[PDB]
Amino acid sequence: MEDEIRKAAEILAKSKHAVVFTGAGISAESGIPTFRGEDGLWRKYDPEEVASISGFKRNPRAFWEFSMEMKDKLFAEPNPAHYAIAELERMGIVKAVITQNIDMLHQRAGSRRVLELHGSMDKLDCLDCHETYDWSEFVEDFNKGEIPRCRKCGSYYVKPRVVLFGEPLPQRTLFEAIEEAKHCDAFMVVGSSLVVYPAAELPYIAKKAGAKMIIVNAEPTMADPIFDVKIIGKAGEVLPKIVEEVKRLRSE
Amino acid sequence: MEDEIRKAAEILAKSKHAVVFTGAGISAESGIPTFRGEDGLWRKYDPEEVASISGFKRNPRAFWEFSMEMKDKLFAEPNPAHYAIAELERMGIVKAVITQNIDMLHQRAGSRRVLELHGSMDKLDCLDCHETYDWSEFVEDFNKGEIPRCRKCGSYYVKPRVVLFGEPLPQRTLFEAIEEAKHCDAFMVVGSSLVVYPAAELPYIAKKAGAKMIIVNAEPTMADPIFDVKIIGKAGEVLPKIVEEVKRLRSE
């Protein structure tokens, strides 16, 4: 109920190094479907098939069609959950965001420190000649429904710098994520089923370290019982109410 | 004269996707001495306390004072070897440089693609507040014996982005280096003893993939037998000779 939101807000209000872990859930209200439930059904291709380093090579066009598909929009924008987190960062509470999302919606919402376990599409590399590119370089190509193509050698294997099925995670980033869980005073999960490594392990790491924990998700997860506050609902509706309640605690 | 140099130039002049792997020996002519023993080094200091991530988190000063004592050249500049390799890239022959060095001399010399397997002294991170700095902000203070401290929070936990004991190699970079060894048509080693992974294995990976193999080192290595050309000598002297010869073949 509203009571759970109260306790979440009370934990955050007295934290100065909170960490927020987000999954596909936090971006569903931005038009980017998750890989679960009806969303997984909605999507045509199987992510493990078309979104692997193998699939990318055998059929780059399908990879892009799958990766860019959205609900009633071409490009996504941050929803109130993203802004709510960036706000908490301005209020001196949130000092880091660890995400498995590759949509860069946290940065665009104003988050200053974002650890991207799966990278992002901010940059791309030609796998044949190694020319590097900024996302902005193919804006016109995408606009007309075409896929990225290397201007230097003509290759269609311009791979975005994200972790595809069959590749390792960014270690400098993985290490920072764990170290982040190890010294945060509050650890809040938002929009994650806590299934994809290290999502299932970070919560236990932060708890051992003594952090207070909160989880905001549309459905329950196996780790729910170890959290202090459990909230079932949409991230875009819950987070902003938590922020407001934190402001009210600091005001009144 | 020198059949080896001519042969090396012949192979390169004919390759369109060559890779260069470099070790500490390529920067010896820039003023940065190589290991020289390395075993005795661990007789003076406990490797776990001065060069491991665990030792760093326990007492930062140990790592930094260890570094000041074995400091050496801090303002070294690339030497002829580094430039020769950059020239080869400009000529459309070399497509990537894989290195174990952390001095960034390859980039400063013009190389556009450098895969740093052991990280580099480019940037540092405060482990407490996450502020990031360029090594250029601490070099001089460090040269005066001043341990770098975070200017924003005052922490003594400013960790450089280099690989320490206890932490894994940068996976995505290693992954790229290996792909590089598998599809190159020419693989050249310069100034590396090829004793420990990955230095010790990449040559064998390129060899199995069918690339031509060249090695330029001051002393033989156990991997020598698989090289099509082997040259004994100083990189800073040999490399420019090979390039000159390649240019001549190109101009005929």
Added chain:
Amino acid sequence: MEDEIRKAAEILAKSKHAVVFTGAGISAESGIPTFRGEDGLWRKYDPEEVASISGFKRNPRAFWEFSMEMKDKLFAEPNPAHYAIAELERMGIVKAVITQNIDMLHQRAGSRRVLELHGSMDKLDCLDCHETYDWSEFVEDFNKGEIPRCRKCGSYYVKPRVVLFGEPLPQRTLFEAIEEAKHCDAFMVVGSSLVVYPAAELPYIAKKAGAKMIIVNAEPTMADPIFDVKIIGKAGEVLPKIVEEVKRLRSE
């Protein structure tokens, strides 16, 4: 009598819960070539292509050709190293073997506790109808020049119960190995370059727990510095010498 061997023995002689971690190097002398250096170069095919889950499905014949390849011998049986380790367990010194090998040589040598991080060829499963099989059941088939084939449904998808490239590492067996390292009093690496996760992590975990560390390998590894005793040599020749010394030390 090499002094490092003697030192390794003194450590084991005073241990009552030693753990041995083995890599491909401990079976090379049994005739199973490793994936590194000359062995890797000598082997037919590229491991990641033929020994991956997709390679197995598209070309089982190549997978079995790769898996059964022998070097310097025609069939594999435990070598002196495997027996030495089994003896150390009989002497009440070694309490567990953690291995990444799938050859079952440790069990054949008599070791009772063996944690198989990558599973083993001991069991096979038809991926189509799920009939399960013992390795012994296909011995005659291999001798006649055929590859395993499900006797119940005719499929050639009889996958040995091992971890193939492209498949995740067994999580429960991984956690048991970590726990093993956290409570041993001696941790000895034999025939591993400590490159394949978690081979590079386990030694550090044991060191933090206070274990005495020993490493026996044909070449130096990146983690060599943290071990108390380092021995360069062939496992099959070194291990029995260590055990003979341990028996002498206990003689009085």
Added chain:
Amino acid sequence: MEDEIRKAAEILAKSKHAVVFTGAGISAESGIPTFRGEDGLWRKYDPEEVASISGFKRNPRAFWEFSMEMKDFAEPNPAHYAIAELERMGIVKAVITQNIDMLHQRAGSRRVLELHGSMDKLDCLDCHETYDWSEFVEDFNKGEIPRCRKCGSYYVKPRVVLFGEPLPQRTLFEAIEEAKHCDAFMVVGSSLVVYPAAELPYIAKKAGAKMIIVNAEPTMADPIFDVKIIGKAGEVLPKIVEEVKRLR
């Protein structure tokens, strides 16, 4: 007989930028069999099985064994040479060929566009690894069909255009440019039935270039030519050259 060839020498002699389009017939003199017409291979073999991509993916051993049956170490004949001399003389500017025998190069021709690729390089359809013919040249002669040394696949396809496959893009591009920028286009030993290669003669014809065709028999595309010579390339081409040295 002379009237036709005499007229042919007249055009080439006056030609400033001539292009030669060759088919399997120009290599008949070298012992290599043609595909269609008389004694053609497509009468003693099924192309859909031994020379089609669908057939290769179906049973790679068919293509490779068919290829082993044709193991014949061939050398240029007077036709290939006549074309190379016509090039040294500055008349012929480039040769577009559908053959993979590489007899045009060995004969001394510098401008050779292999519209249908060559056995020079190969690709594994499974792991995408690439190889030079030299890597299999020894197992092939011993009767062993090429097998990828990286993934063990039996789908190592040489870079030759089989039925159901597109032509190499860069090469098709170069060829069309030549068919456009030419005043003389000569076809030699080509049935002109396989497209899009057979389209080049029309592309050059519609661009205003004189058309000459030397073939051992009339092709169903003769009309487009200003003059056709029905005979053997090894005998007709050499005579075309000398007659050009008489005029020139």
Added chain:
Amino acid sequence: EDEIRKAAEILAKSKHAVVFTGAGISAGLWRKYDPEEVASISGFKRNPRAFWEFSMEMKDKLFAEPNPAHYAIAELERMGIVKAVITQNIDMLHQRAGSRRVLELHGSMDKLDCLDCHETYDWSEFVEDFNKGEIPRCRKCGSYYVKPRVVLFGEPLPQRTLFEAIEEAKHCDAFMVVGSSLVVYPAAELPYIAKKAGAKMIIVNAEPTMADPIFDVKIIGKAGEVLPKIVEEVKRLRSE
């Protein structure tokens, strides 16, 4: 883009182009320091520490390196278009970027000499001490008179280098100025010499110069951003 395309057209058609560079490529001093004491040969013999202290305080940036304009010019030479680079810069950036024929009108810091025992040195032998804030000292005799081969007030400009640069201007087919105000000789005159000889003129600067009128192509912008773009367009005009 417009002027940039024209510049490329000229360079693509030329076979003996010459490039002149000033300080503006590496994008009151004499009120803070006394030039007569920190930058003249008489001041140096009087007190070498003044010149070296002046240099240390004005070192600029650490781990300095060539920028994209230097690499673009080196590339133009590699393409066989540019045959010489005349510069007033003393930081060896053109050579490091790959240029093979560089005429340094003001000398450079790459070579130094002890004025007492005449031992010669490369800058790499002092760069460490310099950046640590220690004055370069002769290791053979101990003297503090280690002077780099740069032109100091009271010393002459390299005569032979100057004449070679004058000759380049007299026989080039294209002359391109990059990052120079063209106010002081010889910088102010070389463009006029090339102009009179019949070469195509190009100038890339952040600001206009009084010599602007004689130039066939005038581009305003940062050299680091303009040159790579000119080089690209030149490659594009060679693919066709």
